[model samples]
Target: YMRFTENFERAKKEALMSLEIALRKGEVDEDIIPLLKKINSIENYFTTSSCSGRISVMEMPHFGDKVNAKWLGKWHREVSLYEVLEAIKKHRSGQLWFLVRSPILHVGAKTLEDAVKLVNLAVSCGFKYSNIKSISNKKLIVEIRSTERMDVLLGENGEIFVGEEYLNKIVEIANDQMRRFKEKLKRLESKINALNR
Candidate 1:
């Protein structure tokens, strides 16, 4: 089931085409570019989608209502509590949250074997949630994900719940997680060539 090798020419062509479109549309996050290129450089794999992780403060009508949610502040790197607090100040209504997202990478493999290999390697490299995310006649996708996450409810209905000290602690936790995932990305990049071996 080396679908990639079987259709190498067409698959790569299409993948590059899509990548260009996504880049032009500003869909791909800027910080993850190097990692994406590393995967694409391999003949048997290419990135489908990825997020390099984020620190964000959001206001939403309710939990999980992203369509009605608004991001008051967002950062692609480690952030300061003062910055988070500044964002929280803008939240005059709804629920406000400080969230930390672990880095996630979705890669399309050429074969079932290849996909499994990547999943195992990623998990070993600290992407504990990594797995075979999907399969189809067209492609086999492996989602490399980490466990670092945060969902601290900072306020509700125009009132703040947590104090500044608590906010500082949460920011420390979020920054630590960001460092962890960034290191994992480095490890994965170093070990990725193992797939070819």
Candidate 2:
């Protein structure tokens, strides 16, 4: 029992230190900071990492090759067709794709019960994909996530495959998705206080 508590404290300290460094380097997602802090203020939980969701244009060597993926452009909020087009103009090689990813958060919980409660709350608040991501003597990780996502192929090998009309349509869809997840984030934030009970 002592060991588990000690480990949780140590792990939380280390995670917070890492978060501080990421913040200093401007790497942590700017919008999710408040939610992260709220969770950390709870005795049993601390956020390890997070993304507040984004729309991005990327270049990758091949499908599912995230290790070699490069972001040509990225936005944390709704984006314009002109901004997306500007990013496409910079694509020089590989497969160019436009993407919209839902908000994702990795949080460490001090106990199994704490983890389960968080997951349940997340799901109730519209983070339907929330779950217990990992478990061990060293840590319990709860993944809070939503389902909003898009992957639209834009071009390949410096050749455009999509027209301006198609791009405009997809941009509208992506922005709608962005608006949806942001609302979910707000819902989650408002309901987070329930965890205190």
Candidate 3:
């Protein structure tokens, strides 16, 4: 069997130092802060990265053209149609989209035991996309993610395909997604202590 405690000590130290740097930059998303603090306070695990989830309007040259994509507007909380339209007004060219992404959290566990327990807990909490994202002699990373997502094409070549009614509908759906995942996050936070058992 792999000796997890041995690897965990070093990984914990390094993760904390890196987390400090990330926090100093204000790079940690606000919504996930409480959960991040809770997870890190535990002995067997620490967070390497996380996103509280988001909705956004983006412009890009073309599909899969992430290299030049521009985020005209983004929000971690529910947004109004007025807010979304304001973002749309900024679009000048290329493809436009309204997107919804579920929250994602990348946690570093000290041991294989810790990793598995956390994954199980996350899965139970509706983070159906959770999995062991990476593993090596250096460390083990468990990626806690969800399937709640939306990719609606709003326009092409600066021409919109949908009207306000459609945008409003999608916004309602996106807000529901946000509520769903936030609930899952809360459940995970409440159950995270199970990993220590």
Candidate 4:
């Protein structure tokens, strides 16, 4: 039984489907057409995940799971493993750049020092901050860009996708990030694990 936070509500549902909730529904949502295309494609692409096997952990397939494929409606399509690998070889990770267009969390204090103090408090727990310094008006901005794009990769759950290979890489990176984040949290907040509830 998984208890999903607001962040993972959609993911919870898709995970259910990925285990075989009419797995093909995602394929159509992904525009994979029908079985004819998927069967021939997995020969090369081979989509499995870090979390669970699309069908079963003990089993591997010659094709993508209809449900898991649906989970990535945007990026899930029957394609050659050669094509998939080529894409992964080309797709880069850990260097994608982003900035918050606005303050993700705005904490107003009586003084600038108070603001810095509040931000610093979170820092011990692995949160970092920088003044937006965009030379904008009055609004102070704080931002975070995760090493893993799970917030983006998982997007809205079953709603966001990249190549299956790309998803795997992101999860790999997310796992690494969480491992370190756990250490930080332990030092900062003993009541928690990195992704602690």
Per-model RMSD to reference: 2.8, 2.8, 2.5, 19.0
Candidate 4 root-mean-square deviation in Å: 19.0
Screening candidate 1 with a backbone cut-off below 3 angstroms (N, C-alpha, C), the clashing residue pairs are none
Model 4, 170-191: lDDT tens per residue?
Answer: 4454445545543543343332
Candidate 1, 87: how far from true, in Å? Answer: 0.6
Query: What is residue 141's positional error in candidate 2, in angstroms?
Result: 1.2
Worst 10 residues of 2 by lDDT: 61-70
Q: Give me the runs in candidate 3 sitting further than 4 Å from their true place.
A: 1-6, 62-67
lDDT per residue as tens, model 2, 1-197: 53445589889999889988988899888788888888888889888878998999998883444567888899999999999999998887789999999999999988777888999999988889999988777788899999888999889988989889999999999999999998999999988877874
Encode model 3's per-residue lDDT on 47-138: one tens digit a residue.
Answer: 88779989999998744444678898999998898899889877777889899999999988877877888888899899989999988777
Off by over 4 Å in 1: 1-9, 21-27, 62-67
- Name model 4 segments beyond 4 Å from true: 1-104, 130-167, 178-197
* Preferred candidate (lDDT higher): 3 or 4: 3
Give the count of colliding residue pairs in each prediction: 0, 0, 0, 6
lDDT of each: 0.84, 0.88, 0.85, 0.29
Q: Candidate 1 on 94-163: residue-level lDDT in tens?
A: 8888899998898888777777888899999999999988776577778999999899888897799988
